[PDB]
Write a protein that binds this ligand. Structure first.
Ligand code: NA
Length: 330
């Protein structure tokens, strides 16, 4: 089997991407944030505290003939940005882009933090990291990918995120029409439950490439590119008037600037992030200070190749016995 679904930015900055997911019988379609940095599939639901729902579409298990309470199971998650959610668990039929899993754990939120409530466009998350990070207790649950894997034509999914445009998540096949050149594969460590890999270095604009190992994760649920402070300082030093602002919480730059590209290495290959991809717009409405898309990972304890980096590539998440990542230009 295979599945193919379109993923659409939630706003004009590509802050996140939503993908429609069918849950239950008859189908209830929710728009979920597919997150390769976490391992819970959780949704706004009929159980969510009413004051914490503001425009999201909810899953109602009582209206699904295939829903079953997973008795005694609970979940609670805290993300890198400080947001959180928790609740109980149902199993139900979940379909993505025509690919169906029966008996998927659907984590129903009883509580969500303010950042979730305030985002009316995201109805929940579908985690695509390794199932060792799943938070369901007392019986850990599998991701949608881990449950689908054995049925897929190939044990892979691909992320093809768009810049200010829709993209695609595919399950079970490589679309050889979706990228240019060849896919360069690189080793993955699953020791922390992430798609963790080592970039071979970077360049700023037309500058020389610096060979240096940068360990980090491929995380579709993170908007920005988080790299070591040395690398980030080297990037923003090429932008006149850029500075790190403690008050704003990262590097800002004049909205009048033209940003340089940023290149990252994948083995001997190179992925070029155009400068435009690194502009996240005014810090507040009408400001001439703009927020940068490359930020320091110092204090986060890991480098994160989030959407700013991933949307410059066709990315293969190879879930074979020994997982690997693949990157292609596009
Ligand atoms: Na922000």
């Amino acid at each position: 089997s295979t599945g193919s679904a379109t993923t659409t930015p939630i706003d004009s900055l590509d802050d996140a991407y939503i993908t429609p997911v069918q849950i239950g019988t008859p189908a209830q379609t929710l728009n979920l944030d597919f997150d390769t940095g976490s391992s819970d599939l959780w949704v706004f639901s009929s159980e969510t505290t009413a004051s914490e729902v503001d425009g999201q579409t909810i899953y109602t298990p009582s209206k699904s003939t295939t829903a079953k309470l997973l008795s005694g199971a609970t979940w609670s998650i805290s993300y890198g940005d400080g947001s959180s959610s928790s609740g109980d668990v149902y199993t139900d039929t979940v379909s993505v882009g025509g690919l169906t899993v029966t008996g998927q754990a659907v984590e129903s939120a009883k509580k969500v933090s303010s950042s979730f409530t305030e985002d009316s466009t995201i109805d929940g998350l579908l985690g695509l990291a390794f199932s060792t990070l799943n938070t369901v207790s007392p019986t850990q649950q599998k991701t949608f990918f881990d449950n689908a894997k054995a049925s897929l034509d190939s044990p892979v999914f691909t992320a093809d995120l768009g810049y200010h445009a829709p993209g695609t998540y595919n399950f079970g096949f490589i679309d050889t029409t979706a990228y240019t050149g060849s896919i360069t594969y690189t080793a993955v460590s699953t020791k922390q439950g992430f798609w963790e890999w080592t970039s071979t270095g970077y360049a700023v604009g037309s500058g020389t490439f610096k060979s240096t190992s940068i360990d980090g994760i491929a995380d579709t649920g993170t908007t920005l590119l988080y790299l070591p402070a040395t690398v980030v300082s080297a990037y923003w030093a090429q932008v006149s008037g850029a500075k790190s602002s403690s008050s704003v919480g990262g590097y800002v730059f004049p909205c009048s600037a033209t940003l340089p590209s940023f290149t990252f290495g994948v083995g001997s290959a190179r992925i070029v992030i155009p400068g435009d991809y690194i502009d996240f717009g005014p810090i507040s409405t009408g400001s001439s200070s703009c927020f940068g898309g490359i930020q320091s990972s110092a204090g986060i304890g890991i480098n994160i190749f989030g959407d700013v980096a991933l949307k410059a590539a066709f990315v293969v998440f190879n879930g074979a016995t020994t997982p690997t990542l693949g990157f292609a230009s596009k």
